[PDB]
Write a protein that binds this DNA or RNA. Sequence first.
RNA 1: UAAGUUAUUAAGGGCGCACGGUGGAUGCCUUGGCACUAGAAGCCGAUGAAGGACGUUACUAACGACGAUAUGCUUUGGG
Length: 58
Amino acid sequence: KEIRNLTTSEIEEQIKSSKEELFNLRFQLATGQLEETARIRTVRKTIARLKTVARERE
RNA sequence: UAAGUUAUUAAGGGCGCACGGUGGAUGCCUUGGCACUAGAAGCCGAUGAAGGACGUUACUAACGACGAUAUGCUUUGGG
């Protein structure tokens, strides 16, 4: 999605979005503390884009 | 006082009509079928098939779509 960043920044980004944001929101939506639930489907799709462009670079 | 004749009763039933219930025929309709015509096409698979199991949404029991990038992603045209 026009991320156009250094591939190591792509790996830092997949590793940040991959657990931290998404895993935290998955715990919050279970223990009854997350509203703005639509964050989740945002982060998921972000973790797809960072992966696809890295695969395009190969 | 005597002789004689005759009738109302309807527990329930019969017929005729009036009004309800049941059940889903018929009329009209069609989301789908049937039989064919002209033109594509007549194979897929070890780069892992046809077919399926399990999963994916903020909930999800099921059906479609999809596959740990999961109720979908990028990019080039239409709108």
